[PDB]
From TrEMBL, chain A:
Family: Belongs to the short-chain dehydrogenases/reductases (SDR) family. FabI subfamily.
List of residues binding NAD(+): G17, D68, V69, V96, A97, K166
Pathway info: Lipid metabolism; fatty acid biosynthesis
GO biological process: fatty acid biosynthetic process
Full protein name: Enoyl-[acyl-carrier-protein] reductase [NADH]
UniProt xrefs under InterPro entries: Enoyl-ACP_Rdtase_NADH, NAD(P)-bd_dom_sf, SDR_fam
Enzyme class: oxidoreductase
Gene Ontology MF, one: enoyl-[acyl-carrier-protein] reductase (NADH) activity
Reactions catalysed: a 2,3-saturated acyl-[ACP] + NAD(+) = a (2E)-enoyl-[ACP] + NADH + H(+)
Keyword field: Fatty acid biosynthesis, Fatty acid metabolism, Lipid biosynthesis, Lipid metabolism, NAD, Nucleotide-binding, Oxidoreductase
Organism: Anaplasma phagocytophilum (strain HZ)
EC number(s) given by UniProt: 1.3.1.9
One Pfam short name: adh_short_C2
CDD domains xref list: ENR_SDR (cd05372)
Gene transcribed to yield this protein: fabI
């Protein structure tokens, strides 16, 4: 639980998507809390609250609030609570995605309408709606951040409809940046490499072929989130920053990496 | 009505989205028909058959079929009709998009859920569904084409959720190209510059968009239906056999402009 710097001192923000200590949302929470941020964590509903409690305790988080990002009334209530507790907000982190697991295993061309719309609602639209509700609380400027992946830009096998959803999200970041920039609110994404069967293969491929010859870590993603959410990042908006050990630059499997 | 070449001789295909003679879909139809294609034109419902009849007659099109891309049964019936008439298909052109006109006037951040979902369904998902229906009719290869716009890539006015929908569409093109390429089916998009379709739309932002593109594009003119037709001829004919997953800009160069023409 050790705080190690003061880069986020005096900044208050909500992180949406921390359900365990292995996730990207957790890596970001740990990084900003270690730099003095005052954080609220969300949990899906009362039934799943006891899972967030100890994560909040280790971070030093004192405010946890219910939020189901597919439910407009739940999101509205969450911001009402933050408004009452804090009056203003400095940052929002949106680390939530959803898509049908079985359709990911199939071909993209076989995607069903229901899965397409559900995935788009949770993975893409929720960010826009959340941004709309955060705006009146972010009077003194601030920073809103979401997460993406290289499958938004190039075809990654079995990422299917999530690639399409993340492409939509990356575009939404740009349109949001224009709307919210009038209030000095930045809007950005981190395009993260995979962090350590299908998943094992993608992770190994990234290890073998990335320029740094390692996988992305939670600490890497936390560092980038600190840039974007602190005063260091005041001049960057509408951007998708790759935090993937350089994988995005590679146009072909390394000649001396093994095929797998 | 006069055929001028043979680039599409022996190719059969369906064009979805021709409702008048001013649209991109019409420009494409005119171009492929003039090169010898056998074309089927869709119309939205029985109400609109009167509007498409004279367009089809002037193109020499003998097959028209209902197709409302929000209704899976309608789409399924359309491909049933093509399979019965032709047995196989060489090309598909998808020129359909929809969003709530009132939300376009406002801010992207105020987009409603209903508008987002409906725009996504019609403007992006329908292309994927149509591609899935075409696949078994194109075992011998061919070409599937959709339309996009620079608002998919960069923020432009009076576009809002359509920018997000088009970005999703351009990503879907890439995924579809991987799925359908083993069968030698190419999947591509044309990112077209704005064209005047109405004498006056009554929307100042549209006048602005058109004017800005005209004066600041490298060619110092607006995109025409002929321009888009020619690009479609590349992508849909044998000339385009080696290109797939691509979004080709047919916008008089506007996409390269970082500031303004001097
Ligand atoms: O840019 P635009 O509005 O000028 O072009 C959009 C096109 O898509 C059509 N379209 C809208 N909804 C449709 C639907 N549900 N099914 C088939 N076509 C549809 C129009 O009829 C039109 O030709």
């Amino acid at each position: 639980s050790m705080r190690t710097g003061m880069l986020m001192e005096g900044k208050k923000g909500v992180i949406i998507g921390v359900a365990n200590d292995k996730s990207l949302a957790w890596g970001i929470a740990k990084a900003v809390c270690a730099q003095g941020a005052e954080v609220a964590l969300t949990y899906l509903s009362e039934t799943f609250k006891k899972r967030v409690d100890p994560l909040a305790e280790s971070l030093g988080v004192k405010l946890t609030v219910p939020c189901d990002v597919s439910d407009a009334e739940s999101v509205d209530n969450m911001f009402k609570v933050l408004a009452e507790e804090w009056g203003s907000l400095d940052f929002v982190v949106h680390a939530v995605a959803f898509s049908d697991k079985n359709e990911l295993k199939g071909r993209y061309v076989d995607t069903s309408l229901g899965n397409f719309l559900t995935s788009m609602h949770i993975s893409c639209y929720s960010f826009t709606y959340i941004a709309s509700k955060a705006e009146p609380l972010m009077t003194n400027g601030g920073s809103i951040l979401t997460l993406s992946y290289y499958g938004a830009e190039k075809v990654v096998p079995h990422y299917n409809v999530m690639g399409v959803c993340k492409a939509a999200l990356e575009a939404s970041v740009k349109y949001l940046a224009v709307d919210l920039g009038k209030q000095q609110i930045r809007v950005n994404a981190i395009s993260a490499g995979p962090v350590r069967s299908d998943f094992h293969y993608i992770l190994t491929w990234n290890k073998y072929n990335s320029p740094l010859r390692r996988n992305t870590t939670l600490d890497d993603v936390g560092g980038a989130a600190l840039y974007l959410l602190s005063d260091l990042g005041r001049g960057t908006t509408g951007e998708t920053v790759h935090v993937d050990c350089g994988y995005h630059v590679v146009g072909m499997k390394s000649v001396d990496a093994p095929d797998i």
